[PDB]
């Protein structure tokens, strides 16, 4: 129970429909490789779309990214408590949240339904989680690698994916076409014929 | 293997901020600044985890204060609009007499300020609609999803009306059953 947040401190200085805009972004990022085995933490600061200063756990301190962040690197790196904290984030924040989130993000599984039709055959796979998926086209038990073109992985925004993989077919009812999907939600390839 | 991102921003002079978490490109949750409440993207996540909402506002406050700081340091160099790339498709593949939802994807824009309407036959529709908050991109633009459940009919013709300062006029993405 109980999700964790990383904070920020003020940079160096002071405060405080066609009108010009100004945007500030902060991105606190946790990268996990092979579960929580190796983990990397980036405390990222943005003006408009530009990364001006960064804490990278693999470096151990703040470093200017552009000349804009130069004064923030010095400033923050002098708050020895701030650095101690950011250096713990890999464990107190990243590994923390991975553990709290694990069962319903990392371990979330939803079955793909793989329909097949034309409107060149569309084999369309919908509403699966997670994104990792393989979609193989088959021609009489032989994998057709050529004349296959695809939609890419499509992120629905609601924690489901969909992908359309179209195969070019010689327009005569010569033989059976098998579209076979593989996914971590399934224990055996889910195949789907058409002849 | 995995990425989790706490992504926030503050925007002048709209004075609007946002705080959310990203998992492999989906939103885990975001805090409703106005309502001071945590909104889980799927109802269930809140059964498994909690997040104390007022903390985000504290963050936003620092975001604000930095923005003010950066603005000056750049000599008030503002943001260059960057128009979106709409796209409309269907959740499941289409069928006649069978229910379905219409996803409108608004990609690669900035600042994160936009106006999305859903119409059918050139007339505004909003029954059952929904949207997500501005979401993060590795190039530091944003995405955003608007949702409209509906019913396959031959006669009906839908458009996702999308306006944004980088655009030079509103933007329509026609969609109809084929």
């Amino acid at each position, epitope marked *: *129970f*109980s*999700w*964790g*947040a*990383e*904070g*920020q*401190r*003020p940079g160096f200085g*002071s*405060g*405080g429909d066609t009108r010009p805009r100004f945007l500030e972004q902060v991105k606190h990022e946790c990268h996990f490789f092979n579960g929580t085995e190796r983990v990397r933490f980036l405390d990222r600061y943005f003006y408009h779309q530009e990364e001006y200063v960064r804490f990278d756990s693999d470096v151990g301190e703040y470093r200017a990214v552009t000349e804009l962040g130069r004064p923030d690197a010095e400033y923050w790196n002098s708050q020895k*408590d701030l650095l101690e*904290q950011k250096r*713990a984030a890999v464990d*107190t*924040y990243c590994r*923390h*949240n991975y*553990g709290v989130g694990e069962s319903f993000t990392v371990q979330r599984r939803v079955y793909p339904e793989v329909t097949v039709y034309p409107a060149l055959l569309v084999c369309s796979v919908n509403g699966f989680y997670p994104g990792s998926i393989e979609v193989r086209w088959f021609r009489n038990g032989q994998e057709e690698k050529t004349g296959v073109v695809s939609t890419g992985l499509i992120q629905n925004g609601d924690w489901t994916f969909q992908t359309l993989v179209m195969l070019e077919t010689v327009p005569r009812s010569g033989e059976v076409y098998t579209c076979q999907v593989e996914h971590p939600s399934l224990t055996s390839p889910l195949t789907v014929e058409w002849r | 293997e995995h990425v989790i991102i706490q992504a926030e921003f503050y925007l002048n002079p709209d*004075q609007s901020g946002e705080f959310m978490f990203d998992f492999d490109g989906d939103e885990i949750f975001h805090v409703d600044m106005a309502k*001071k409440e945590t909104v889980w993207r799927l109802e269930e996540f809140g059964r498994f985890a909690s997040f*104390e909402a*007022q*903390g985000a*506002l*504290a*963050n*936003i*406050a*620092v975001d*604000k*204060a930095n923005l003010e700081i950066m603005t000056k340091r750049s000599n008030y160099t503002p943001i260059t609009n960057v128009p979106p790339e709409v796209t409309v498709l269907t959740n499941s593949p289409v069928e006649l007499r069978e229910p379905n939802v219409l996803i409108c994807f608004i990609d690669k824009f900035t600042p994160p300020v936009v106006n999305v309407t859903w119409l059918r036959n050139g007339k505004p529709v909003t029954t059952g609609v929904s949207e997500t908050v501005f979401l993060p991109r590795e190039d530091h633009l944003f995405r955003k999803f608007h949702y409209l459940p509906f019913l396959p009919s031959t006669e009906d013709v839908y458009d996702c009306r999308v306006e944004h300062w980088g655009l030079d006029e509103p933007l329509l993405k026609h969609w109809e059953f084929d």
Partner: T-cell receptor
Amino acid sequence: AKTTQPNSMESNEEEPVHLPCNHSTISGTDYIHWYRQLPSQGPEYVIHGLTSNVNNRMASLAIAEDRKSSTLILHRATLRDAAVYYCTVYGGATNKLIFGTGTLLAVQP
Amino acid sequence: VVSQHPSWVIAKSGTSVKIECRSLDFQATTMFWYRQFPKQSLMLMATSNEGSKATYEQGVEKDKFLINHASLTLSTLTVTSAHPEDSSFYICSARGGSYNSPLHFGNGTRLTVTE
């Protein structure tokens, strides 16, 4: 708020004192913090930690292996060490600092 | 460092008392307001995030106290309709950041109200 202390403790000067705190629901993203307050002043930071041991001049903090309790250790008590001692939690799950009822420590001359 | 002002305050009923909490040597993103009655503990009243409407803790009388946070260096508490029951110790703290940034306390303002 999420901590529990003995309301008061008695102790002799020149002896070390061990102030106990329970905090059995503390998140692994929050830290254990200790503050003390003299009779009419604001509270002041004494020490804080995450796990295991922490020490500074005159004062140490011993956190149990499971993080469900901790101890503030005063190595040698002076008469001026007599205060209210507050065990609090503060961190990544907890953005406000709430003081509980604390422990009222007397240092017998 | 953070300084409250004034340290000591005597006020007649129904007046209004103004306490200032200022962070001398840093930008305060959040100011907290605590008060403490005799024999009792510190209790949080309100949380102020710079350039925003303060949030009050439950059980806290909504209209009685007023925060004005406009500076990022200054926050101002105002007690309205001074009542003897508001004779208490009042403490503010400034935080230069959010999660895990240290609170810095004023040294308090001792308020007594007599009709």
